[PDB]
Ligand SMILES: Cc1ncccc1[C@H]1C[C@@H](c2cccc3nc(N)ccc23)Nc2c(F)cnn21
């Protein structure tokens with residue numbers, strides 16, 4: 189007789205993230221700039237919040253919710269922040285011997301606990 | 315010697331989407347209301363654009379970019395729109411014998427071509 193069905197699209201989340209990275213490339217509906225000393229990164233707050241305890245805290249603070257510019261701590265590496273923003277929008281964490289420690293430091297500052305734990309493994313591997 | 319590594323987080327996209335659905339539940343950084351005759355659905359424009367040709371077109375139109383309210387065609391089923399918004403934020407398409415045709419109609423209105431094609435299969439299955 190009658191048949192209700194819940195259908196799982198396994199590629200859906202990945203497709204969403206590709207499309208979110210494409211909006212970011214074309215600067216579509218980006219609503220915040222992240223300033224890392226001399227560098228700037230345009231992003232969507234919702235993606236930052238979804239990926240970072242720190243951005244979650246900032247944009248859930250009802251004062252800071254509407255900020256269009258966020259200045260990161262002077263100590264934060266721009267190259268490392270860039271790697272972690274790419275990771276947020278692609279699921280791909282790109283590590284070099286040269287940056288791994290800066291990436292891990294930035295991940296911890298950003299409260300990206302799973303990225304930090306993966307950084308720990310790469311360190312031992314090398 | 316030196317070892318660069320690009321690491322794939324297979325669960326990352328799914329985790330992002332869970333967190334995006336949680337922001338929507340708690341109405342955090344939602345920036346549009348979709349009015350379907352008598353009903354309203356708060357959402358994030360970036361997720362709509364990522365999932366729907368129609369919302370892609372609307373929010374890329376530089377006039378309509380900043381709209382906080384979108385009125386859908388009077389003919390559109392609210393129950394069907396709700397199913398497709400849940401699908402956008404969860405990857406799960408929930409179909410009943412009663413709504414499948416309305417879901418497919420709404421998917422096509424929204425330019426969600428992969429959802430329409432899956433609706434076609436369910437129709438034959440039942
Ligand atoms: C509070 C909560 N409960 C259940 C599920 C999810 C959440 C939080 C988690 C938060 C988030 C992400 C990634 C690393 C995080 N690390 C920390 N130390 C803190 C928050 C972190 N991001 C997010 C959203 F965009 C929506 N909800 N949440």
Ligand SMILES: Cc1ncccc1[C@H]1C[C@@H](c2cccc3nc(N)ccc23)Nc2c(F)cnn21
Pocket residue numbers: 207208210211360363364365366367368370425426427
């Ligand atoms: C233009 C383009 N080229 C390559 C890759 C992606 C895109 C478009 C596709 C568009 C979108 C989604 C889902 C069904 C769509 N159906 C239609 N008929 C039209 C657009 C549809 N959504 C989206 C973003 F949020 C960012 N980019 N894009």
